[PDB]
Design a binder for this molecule. Structure first.
Ligand SMILES: CC[C@H]1CC(O)=C(C2=Nc3ccc(NS(C)(=O)=O)cc3S(=O)(=O)N2)C(=O)N1Cc1ccc(F)cc1
Length: 557
């Protein structure tokens, strides 16, 4: 069937949408070439609608069913609990979209009777009705990029009340099932250090290692009614309260399989018959469906000793090489299989023989040396987008601070240390907002983070070596430098000079601030200070951090 049907009605915004990078006093110190940076708006949605709207054909063979059977066998070992209204409300982001029924995110959060009562009736209606499609809102995301222009991505989501109900029935399942089903292949269990560790070990466990990433063209669109039914049958294998079983089935038929699409003004835009991007099961459903399809496609393509790493729709395979010709013909069969299962590629997959040339989760492996000169691997990426978005966040307050997300996830990198840390700590010092808790996203989940805990966070996710890393690869250095020339970002010798200031200013303040200066900026000085384990680092509660993915799942820890 068709992924989408359109009435002709326009996808509308809520407020005004800026496409031009906003400029303030701090902007120029980070980025000169302001015309290179832009944010997508709802005005480019018409182009996105064309792209993601196609007919899907699915041809399921024996490999497909075998893998599914294996997945169900493990899923049936899981016991998941029904969450209470209260517990589910505590999981709602403070900046989450208001309900059409008179209450908002903060009303839900502090458990007002108006919020709690409507959630109960939405739940009750879920138990009684397993057929009536549920209203969803379609919006256009505002994402910032650098020109190379991309049309906006679409977000489809049900009303707040339903989102809380999703959490009640499905929060435990989506948090626990994927690891049990997919084992070490499930990538959202991994912190950066563990992921690097796992990619490298996997690369080393192969006599002649070959690797490739598989980019599906618009994954959400390729997902069929079948895939959503299949993913529900997986959920139903769990030991579940009879109320959870009813709700899950109901949400599958009424929400996850499809439904009408309503713009922010209240007009009907059309109908969806594919994956909604703003439901709780978006991440887990895509991960299960991607894993199922790929594993089966490995059997069809007869890939020798393949280890898979899956994060939602992001997929990387590492296996034994049969030589460049056989690898090329293997990947075609893989691609044909995936295409038959309704997961065609965007770019054709290419086999890589160097681990560092492989991109997965927008990240590639690279190597540096620590204080002992001892080789250490870390994940990095092209810094073009993270810097473009930092530039935007230098001039505009945002609900999600991507700069912090990038520092947390890319702390060991050259560009996050010298540019991102230096720039933003400079900003926080001038405002005296070091103690101020900030919101960011890790694996789709929203986190309130105090910047002064960054040293303790980095020690736990990357290890101490992250504060010492030096002698970066020529290839990494070339990419970082090429980005700054393109963007008009000051050279890295200017950033070092600025870092000396930021460090001293932090040290002069003592307490947790001096701790930040000591660890985060030890690189900037020739006369190096010794970096021992942090006194109160093991105090921070880092549970929930790397259990599951929750992209568009409206989650807050
Ligand atoms: C700053 C971004 C950083 C952290 C991060 O949240 C992600 C991420 N990766 C994803 C990858 C794929 C999806 N696809 S989806 C929509 O769930 O089907 C969703 C996410 S996500 O929304 O859950 N977030 C991500 O890919 N990265 C890069 C990364 C990943 C692992 C790592 F160890 C280091 C950096």
């Amino acid at each position: 069937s068709m992924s989408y049907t359109w009435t002709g009605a326009l996808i509308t915004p809520c407020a005004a949408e800026e496409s031009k990078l906003p400029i303030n006093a701090l902007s120029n110190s980070l980025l000169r070439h302001h015309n290179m940076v832009y944010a997508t708006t709802s005005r480019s949605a018409g182009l996105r609608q064309k792209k993601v709207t196609f007919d899907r054909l699915q041809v399921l063979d024996d490999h497909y069913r075998d893998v599914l059977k294996e997945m169900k066998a493990k899923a049936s070992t899981v016991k998941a609990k029904l969450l209470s209204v209260e517990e589910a409300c505590k999981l709602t982001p403070p900046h989450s979209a208001k309900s059409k029924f008179g209450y908002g995110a903060k009303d839900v959060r502090n458990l007002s009777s108006k919020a709690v009562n409507h959630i109960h009736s939405v739940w009750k209606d879920l138990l009684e009705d397993t057929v009536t499609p549920i209203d969803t809102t379609i919006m256009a995301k505002n994402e910032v990029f650098c020109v190379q222009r991309k049309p906006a991505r679409l977000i489809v989501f049900p009303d707040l009340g339903v989102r809380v109900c999703e959490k009640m029935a499905l929060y435990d399942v989506v948090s626990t099932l994927p690891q049990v089903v997919m084992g070490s292949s499930y990538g959202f269990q991994y912190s950066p250090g563990q992921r690097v560790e796992f990619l490298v070990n996997t690369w080393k466990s192969k006599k002649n290692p070959m690797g490739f990433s598989y980019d599906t063209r618009c994954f959400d669109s390729t997902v069929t009614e079948n895939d959503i039914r299949v993913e529900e049958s997986i959920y139903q294998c769990c030991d579940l309260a009879p109320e959870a079983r009813q709700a899950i089935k109901s949400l599958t038929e009424r929400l996850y399989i499809g439904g009408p699409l309503t713009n922010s003004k209240g007009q009907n835009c059309g109908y969806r018959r594919c994956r909604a991007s703003g439901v709780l099961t978006t991440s887990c459903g895509n991960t299960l469906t991607c894993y199922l399809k790929a594993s089966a496609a490995c059997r069809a393509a007869k890939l020798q000793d393949c280890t898979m790493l899956v994060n939602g729709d992001d997929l990387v395979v590492i296996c034994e090489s049969a030589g460049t010709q056989e690898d090329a013909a293997s990947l075609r069969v893989f691609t044909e299989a995936m295409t038959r299962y309704s997961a065609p590629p965007g770019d054709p997959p290419q086999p890589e023989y160097d681990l560092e040339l492989i991109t997965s989760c927008s990240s590639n492996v690279s190597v540096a040396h620590d204080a002992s000169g001892k080789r250490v691997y870390y994940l990095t990426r092209d810094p073009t987008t993270p810097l473009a978005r930092a530039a935007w966040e230098t001039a505009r307050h945002t609900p999600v601070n991507s700069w912090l997300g990038n520092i947390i996830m890319y702390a060991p990198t050259l560009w996050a240390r010298m540019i991102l840390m230096t720039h933003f700590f400079s900003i926080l010092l001038a405002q005296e907002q070091l103690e101020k808790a900030l919101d960011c996203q890790i694996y789709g989940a929203c986190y309130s983070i105090e910047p002064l805990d960054l040293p303790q966070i980095i020690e736990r996710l990357h290890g101490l070596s992250a504060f010492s890393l030096h002698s970066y690869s020529p290839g990494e250095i070339n990419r970082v430098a090429s980005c700054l020339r393109k963007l008009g970002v000051p050279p890295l010798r200017v950033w070092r000079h600025r870092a000396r200031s930021v460090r001293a200013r932090l040290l002069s303040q003592g307490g947790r601030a001096a701790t930040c200066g000591k660890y985060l900026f030890n690189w900037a000085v020739k006369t190096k200070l010794k970096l021992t384990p942090i006194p109160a680092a093991s105090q921070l509660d880092l549970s929930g951090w790397f259990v599951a993915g929750y992209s568009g799942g409206d989650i807050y820890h």
